[PDB]
């Protein structure tokens, strides 16, 4: 969209940074900065993930929950695809994803492939979806469902 494209283009430009420059931007990250690309072939999602899950971030971008793992790390890299009761239109077709579909996450240094292994509906107060189990490498997408009343959760495990 507007800010989305910008965040997206600014991040892609950093692929041409050197390694210390990349590492330096790792530290220094601020809410609203691009941190990864996300591609989900099954539903035509090809965009960027911003840091943070505040209302301000989520108005323009898919956002990374602050205290969750980063892509490829032990724990559960968690992303928010709604702002209050409104899904980012980028996830309008998330209900088409199935167990076994792939989610590709590209940081400045690596391509991580996650495979969906759990889909479920829960409440807005179910904070456990953001839990960090450091014995595994997983990711989570949180959007809304049921006229904004419930949360639609997609979880995926790192495969490559």
Residue numbers in the entry: 28 to 187
What does the paper say about this structure?
The assembly and anchorage of various pathogenic proteins on the surface of Gram-positive bacteria is mediated by the sortase family of enzymes. These cysteine transpeptidases catalyze a unique sorting signal motif located at the C-terminus of their target substrate and promote the covalent attachment of these proteins onto an amino nucleophile located on another protein or on the bacterial cell wall. Less is known about the members of the class D family of sortases (SrtD), but they have a suggested role in spore formation in an oxygen-limiting environment. In the current study, we present the crystal structure of a C. perfringens transpeptidase which belongs to the class D family of sortases, suggesting a potential role of this enzyme in C. perfringens spore formation.
